[PDB]
Design a protein around this nucleic acid. Structure first.
Ligand SMILES: [Mg+2]
Lengths: 92, 95, 91
RNA sequence: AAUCCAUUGCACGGAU
RNA sequence: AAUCCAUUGCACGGAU
RNA sequence: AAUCCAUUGCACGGAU
């Protein structure tokens, strides 16, 4: 989805990277754009190669996506959209 | 030839998912690109040489420039948009 | 590196393109983002398929990276990062 | 309309 | 853990 | 010069 959101959806991630390293790496890269509330990574069948970065502010999310769109990350260009719906911690 | 990087009122988008029909492509493109400025037109055609392609015409060059810097590589119907500036002025702009 | 720098690092370049045409073609793409101080290309084994574009202003390098990330050059998407270290002409 | 073949194309095609 | 196979997936797998 | 093999490499090769 193209509708600005607090959360960015990243896919095409290198699946060899384990959750802890991926979370640390995504936080170091994306922290620059503003305060990150959380990064949700899962390694199960439907969730690998994927991350949700939840920014406190939409303006940080918009800036992260526009700057990091296509950035080569562990040999794969990041594909970044806005999450299709609000992440739970944002919804409350 | 190289990607065209000389700012222009019009951005040229290729590598569009060709399964998307004209009406929906224009409607989706408007929804995405209207956040960068006022859009005068969006030219889509589904002929052989025109498929996979759109011209989005902004009233001001500054909007084209923001649109290109922002939406480059956006995953749009599972294919990253490829954006340049239009080689030459659109007719709407020329008059 | 993901940190803005005066210098952009490009790889996944079509190794068939020769130095002069690669350098001329990179100026024609990237010069439109602001003044380029230098474009460094070598075709030696460790250096081929790569270029460093040194901009005068960091805003120019940032606009160039964001705007041309993944854009096909001689049938290959350009992979653009910021240089890990300042180019010598900058330092 | 749909499925398939082909098309990465800078403007103001073919098959069932 | 690792290795191989499969998976491009919008959330709060299989084999040694 | 051309072509083949190898190389995805963060700087200031082999081969006909
Ligand atoms: Mg078809």
């Amino acid at each position: 989805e193209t509708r600005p959101n607090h959360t960015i959806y990243i896919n095409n991630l290198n699946e060899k990277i384990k959750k802890d390293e991926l979370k640390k790496s995504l936080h170091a890269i994306f922290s620059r754009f503003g305060q990150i509330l959380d990064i949700l990574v899962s390694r199960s069948l439907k969730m690998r190669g994927q991350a949700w970065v939840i920014f406190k502010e939409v303006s940080s999310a918009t800036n992260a996506l526009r700057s990091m769109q296509g950035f080569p990350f562990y040999d794969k260009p990041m594909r970044i959209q806005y999450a299709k719906t609000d992440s739970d911690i944002i919804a409350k």
